[PDB]
Enzyme design. Sequence first.
Site, mmCIF file in Angstrom:
data_model
loop_
_atom_site.group_PDB
_atom_site.id
_atom_site.type_symbol
_atom_site.label_atom_id
_atom_site.label_comp_id
_atom_site.label_asym_id
_atom_site.label_seq_id
_atom_site.Cartn_x
_atom_site.Cartn_y
_atom_site.Cartn_z
ATOM 1 N N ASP A 133 0.836 -1.191 0.000
ATOM 2 C CA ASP A 133 0.000 0.000 0.000
ATOM 3 C C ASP A 133 0.876 1.248 0.000
ATOM 4 O O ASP A 133 1.931 1.282 0.637
ATOM 5 C CB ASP A 133 -0.927 -0.006 1.217
ATOM 6 C CG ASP A 133 -1.823 1.217 1.279
ATOM 7 O OD1 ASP A 133 -2.683 1.375 0.388
ATOM 8 O OD2 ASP A 133 -1.667 2.021 2.222
ATOM 9 N N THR B 299 -3.869 5.944 -2.777
ATOM 10 C CA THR B 299 -2.626 6.480 -2.236
ATOM 11 C C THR B 299 -1.438 6.220 -3.154
ATOM 12 O O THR B 299 -0.576 7.091 -3.313
ATOM 13 C CB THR B 299 -2.359 5.878 -0.855
ATOM 14 O OG1 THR B 299 -3.575 5.866 -0.096
ATOM 15 C CG2 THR B 299 -1.331 6.697 -0.111
ATOM 16 N N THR B 300 -1.378 5.032 -3.764
ATOM 17 C CA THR B 300 -0.299 4.727 -4.699
ATOM 18 C C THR B 300 -0.454 5.520 -5.990
ATOM 19 O O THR B 300 0.536 5.985 -6.566
ATOM 20 C CB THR B 300 -0.266 3.225 -4.985
ATOM 21 O OG1 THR B 300 -0.334 2.501 -3.750
ATOM 22 C CG2 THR B 300 1.015 2.841 -5.709
ATOM 23 N N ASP C 211 -8.952 -1.048 3.756
ATOM 24 C CA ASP C 211 -8.991 -0.471 2.418
ATOM 25 C C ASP C 211 -10.288 -0.828 1.704
ATOM 26 O O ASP C 211 -10.838 -0.010 0.959
ATOM 27 C CB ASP C 211 -7.788 -0.952 1.607
ATOM 28 C CG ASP C 211 -7.685 -0.274 0.259
ATOM 29 O OD1 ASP C 211 -7.130 0.841 0.200
ATOM 30 O OD2 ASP C 211 -8.158 -0.855 -0.740
#
Lengths: 526, 525, 525
Positions: free
Chosen positions: B58, B91-92, B392
């Site tokens: 993540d 987020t990535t 998530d």
Amino acid sequence: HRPVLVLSQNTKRESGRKVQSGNINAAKTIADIIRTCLGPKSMMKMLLDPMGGIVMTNDGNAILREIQVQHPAAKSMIEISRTQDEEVGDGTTSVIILAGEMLSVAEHFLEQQMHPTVVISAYRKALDDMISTLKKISIPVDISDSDMMLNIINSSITTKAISRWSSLACNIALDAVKMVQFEENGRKEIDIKKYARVEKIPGGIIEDSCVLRGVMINKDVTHPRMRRYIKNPRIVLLDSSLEYKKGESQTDIEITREEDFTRILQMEEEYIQQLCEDIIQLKPDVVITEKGISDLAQHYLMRANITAIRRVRKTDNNRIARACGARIVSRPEELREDDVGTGAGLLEIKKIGDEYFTFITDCKDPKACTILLRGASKEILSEVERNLQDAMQVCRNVLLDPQLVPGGGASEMAVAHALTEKSKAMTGVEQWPYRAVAQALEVIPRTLIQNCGASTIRLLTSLRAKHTQENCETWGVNGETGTLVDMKELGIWEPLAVKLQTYKTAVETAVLLLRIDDIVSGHKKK
Amino acid sequence: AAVKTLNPKAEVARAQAALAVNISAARGLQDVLRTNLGPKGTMKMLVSGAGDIKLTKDGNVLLHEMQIQHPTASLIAKVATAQDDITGDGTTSNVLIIGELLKQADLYISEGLHPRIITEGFEAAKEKALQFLEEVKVSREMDRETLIDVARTSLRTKVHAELADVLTEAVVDSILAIKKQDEPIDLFMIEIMEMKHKSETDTSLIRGLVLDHGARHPDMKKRVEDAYILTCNVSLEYEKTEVNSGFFYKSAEEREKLVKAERKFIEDRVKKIIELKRKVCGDSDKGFVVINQKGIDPFSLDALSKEGIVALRRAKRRNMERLTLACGGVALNSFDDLSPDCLGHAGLVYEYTLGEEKFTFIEKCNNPRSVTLLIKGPNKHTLTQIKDAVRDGLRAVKNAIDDGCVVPGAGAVEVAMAEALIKHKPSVKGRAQLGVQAFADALLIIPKVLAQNSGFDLQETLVKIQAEHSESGQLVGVDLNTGEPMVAAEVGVWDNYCVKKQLLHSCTVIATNILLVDEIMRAGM
Amino acid sequence: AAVKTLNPKAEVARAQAALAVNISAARGLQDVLRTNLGPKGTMKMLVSGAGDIKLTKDGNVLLHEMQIQHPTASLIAKVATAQDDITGDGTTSNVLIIGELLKQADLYISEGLHPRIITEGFEAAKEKALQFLEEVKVSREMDRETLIDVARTSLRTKVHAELADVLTEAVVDSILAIKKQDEPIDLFMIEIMEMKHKSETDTSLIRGLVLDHGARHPDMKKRVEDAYILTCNVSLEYEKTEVNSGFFYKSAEEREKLVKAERKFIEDRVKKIIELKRKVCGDSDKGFVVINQKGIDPFSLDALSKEGIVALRRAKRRNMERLTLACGGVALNSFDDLSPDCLGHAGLVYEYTLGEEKFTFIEKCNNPRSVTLLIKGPNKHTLTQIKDAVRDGLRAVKNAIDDGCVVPGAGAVEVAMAEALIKHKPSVKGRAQLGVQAFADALLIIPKVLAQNSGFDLQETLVKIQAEHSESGQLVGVDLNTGEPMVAAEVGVWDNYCVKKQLLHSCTVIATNILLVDEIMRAGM
Ligand SMILES: Nc1ncnc2c1ncn2[C@@H]1O[C@H](COP(=O)(O)OP(=O)(O)O)[C@@H](O)[C@H]1O
Ligand SMILES: Nc1ncnc2c1ncn2[C@@H]1O[C@H](COP(=O)(O)OP(=O)(O)O)[C@@H](O)[C@H]1O
Ligand SMILES: Nc1ncnc2c1ncn2[C@@H]1O[C@H](COP(=O)(O)OP(=O)(O)O)[C@@H](O)[C@H]1O
């Protein structure tokens, strides 16, 4: 080892031209640091602090607070920008560049074998004429007009980083000052540091940030049985605790009989029921205190359907006392009907990013508000918080002194021609340092064109010729395009209290640093 | 330098120097995090100074637990922290847009242009990209088969697709039995427990609650059927007076009369409990379970064991909110108004021990509105894989219920958004023509990274995808198996609307602020 | 890595790591050396460890006298060494092509492609760039007014255009009177002397030679008119036998006979000189100058001064080659065949002292074919400005005489060559389509740097220049005064053909080899 018989051990001595011309180079150095942070085409400056954080800003006060200098004359210029930040909002950077330029022209006369008391006596005569010139070129402001006040605050945030969201930041900063405009007795006061709290939450977008009609705190309810949604609550603010603590004495009980120990533990329960019965005689809905609430106090408020908040701060209790109209009491048995904060709107315990926030909004007539800022991270939310502090204090100066000065270079050149025409009747040795004050004021329109990339020779000749005639006299420098536009068409207007404090602090900084001819360093104190 | 004059121990960076500091550090975080985007990404093993293995990929856990000391890397880590706090996934993909917004702008600022002119084109491109996102969103009325495909996309990008079929039935079915009638779903009602029992592919959904502590008495019942839950906040253990008093006795026979008297206030609380078990028609089994957040002394545990009452101690703060909804009782703080109305109900209450660590299970509730995902990972690092994937996936299905529209999948959004900026590129009418081109090329990294992590060509894939989008009206995307352009709205690959909305807003402001930085310096010592 | 296992003190760089080392270092040399290309460049003050000032802006002197320790910077410095060794100018433009051949290739290699695919496009672009260079060259039959504009272009880019009007008359008129009838011009026939007399704008062209040593006897004539040059290589000073012999004498009267006899072989060489002065009709002034490469004892200097013969000593190796052509005599190594045929002639031989340092001047020759540029710079660092610009200008006019064609100036070559690669870009028919685009954009840095150093816009200038080339047939270029596109063949701005030919060959091979490097490592300890 026989010691050497000396005097004033481990200290330095410096005098002559090395200190008079040495304090000028220390003042010119700080003027070159924040030179690219004046106009609307300014750029951010990323700073690093020893605490571990990162300060990315372009305001002149927040840059100099993170700079640790060793020169004593350089420490004086940092306290000048701190004085401008506490008096007005957007009056700091302009002072450091102007004080560096008034000392730049003062170094020329120190090489001409002129005494520093002669240049300062010419600076005080020039200081008294710059104040009288700004009062002649001012314009009265209608403070009741809403669209007129939006153009004043837009002129102060065009420099800062919130110029992109100009339609939002003007309405937030104007409505924040007009709510906290409190007047109990015969004295008008605006407190935008104790009542206008700027709470920032990381997340969301910047366009959803708006000023709430009330306060908010990052506190959850004390018990899950209590309600999280009250339409019209009767908020009662407390200061003391709802628990049983040790008194301020030397109380010690001698337990001899069997029934005495069980009676003390029952009197501790009955004391909590006595104060909980005194606060429900007024039939409240929300009980807010600053100290702890025991589980026995939560039991009586549960069956009475009372939402209790536990550990609200002292500064947040004074802010909610003005928003809801309550009075902070410190005695449960001395509660009155005037101490209950009626008129509060919708109370809702929302959650923003896995954390509860108590919202007390939609008030009838609040005297304190909370600006809810939401952004990408804590880095840029500290920028909007520092820019809204410079956006709310420039609205406070208009409500205390409704006069506007044409900014953007038009203010500095209108006095530079007034000092030039008034210097023709001097006929003395103070005439030549009097002329250098008018040339030192020209560095503010010089910095507006050096940041946007315009010409500094072709523009200053045309701008100085515009102030020769007495008709228009309000022509400044357009920092957006780079040409000469009149300030009656652009709408760039600065308040009088910002322009007066800029000139009064830049001259008196040159008064202090020119009388310094000696520096002694190396002594200890107690 | 001017800062070197006043403070000689203060490093500085100039205008052309501080831009090269931030751009080269943005490519450093881009080249690391681009090898784990999507289902075909690579795992990362993160070892701290102690020696524990943190195996995850993540983007928020990678940026926090990375040995990097850089001011530009700390700015992107602050924006990446707020992305995983309010909406979970995204987020990535957040770091790759920032790494491309500074790399595509590097080709124009170094070629004579000013950094402020590029930022004027980013705002004009962000307004058109935000209006285009509101036209491509698909509303499907929050069907439970739609939420499966939303949770399948977020779970496949964090596990090897054998547990993604198991965790989809544990995330979608857990988020539906919380709130109804268009109510905001609280994520605190779902407890996340870590077990070690069978294997990683055995995570089930407990419809009630799972407590991490068990009974503290050996004579209590281990398996209780048809129990009454009495949630308490009282202190059944021995507590002293607030005023320090001390006992005073004359004889030795009067000493034992004070030990009986000092426990009389404690035993009166126990007599309120054992009389409640008799007032609920106790001519049957009639089990009683007390969770009891505050601790219990062993003198009261021996008294409750003789009456057949299971008593726990030292619970959590939020256990008085999750069990209150699950059992249906009332969390009491006193025993002055005890009644059978405040009692709960559960068909089965049992315990299980895993290496001197008991776990109390509460199951068989009618309408619990509070559940528990029982993660049973074998290793310590495998527990962190499922926990970072459950939170998530739960935040993914929470945004698909609160927002009524679902945004399409991998390449069905970013390719169509970049092509919409080309036709509006001559609409800015000024020097900011190249700012819209730098924003359109930065959004195309999402089909570029997913084609690179799948082993396919980067440039040959983007030609065929943009050809199928321009020659049709369907939002075509990237396929992680064959490389052919496939539509994401039909194959079952979806995304959240608030993720792509915040990716266009958080990455744009943080790029217009970094490009306008020219005085990176370290002072204050 | 494998190198870390064998040698623990050996650093290494991997495939994606060694590419970022060479490209970022090429941008480091590009951003420094681009501030001195053309006449609008800035002077660079280079201070060594001793403290001497080396004020110059040539690309070869900048790369050598720079405190840099990098393996990539050492590769470009070796290619820049050969550019200033065989053809003079073309060193600053050499590094800027390599700085753009690696930066424009990084936009494709980082976007999925292989570095060998880009190098296949460089060879196909070099074949078209070599054929296009032969079509734009202009043959002007080596006119003496053409060589002025060739020397003026190379001299302005190294001086402030007040000495360029003086040095062009000293470079063009020096290179014409060396060799005729299609002979290769030797640059060793031009002597470069550093003086300090008047000022930097006083460098004249001496038609003969200027020797840095004067007469070593106070009775010799300082100003000699209508002289005879006798170039010798014999040693007039006292030398002994090769075998160690010594003397042996009995009485003191035989001691003085051996000192008189040991100088008989020395005085026999002097008697051959003073008898040659009597055989050239010495009933007039009839001055005699002996340059005499080997040293002369003061006994023979006193003998030659009484007859009226100026005798110098300790000449250079090439002074017997330059003065032999200038005087027309024969450089003899013995006095066995002395004759008036081996004597020279000069109308004026005089000396001048500059701070206890004499300088012998030889002027007024008939056909010298050997000249001397007398640089009279005021400061020591100003002598290095003129000497590095004279050899930059002498090698520019030497290539324009040897090659039969002249190449146009600033933007008349690089812009027209880049437009020829666009129309021949679909001619490769393969994966190397983007390699010709990276080579065409790298050649456009020469109009981009010249528009940047002059203060004009970078992108706005390249649009107007490429518009005048596409809508006409004239090779238009860059004007460093107004910014408008002006033709370089009409304003008098030319360049060398061998400089632009080697810029397409030395920069292309060194770029295809650097892009194919992926294992930068340091081993051997
Ligand atoms: N649109 C504009 N055109 C011309 N000048 C402007 C414009 N906007 C701001 N300025 C000028 O930029 C300056 C910014 O000053 P500032 O640094 O904000 O002062 P302080 O540090 O006291 O807040 C102002 O003095 C103003 O004259
Ligand atoms: N099954 C799938 N097929 C194609 N693309 C997918 C699939 N699952 C996820 N993706 C893509 O992977 C990208 C990143 O997903 P994820 O890693 O969960 O979020 P982040 O990268 O923000 O952490 C998404 O933008 C999505 O388009
Ligand atoms: N008068 C001029 N007008 C326009 N361009 C010029 C002029 N003189 C030189 N240049 C350009 O400057 C470039 C570099 O010249 P120079 O510095 O002498 O060679 P190098 O850069 O290889 O050392 C040449 O390519 C030439 O086109």
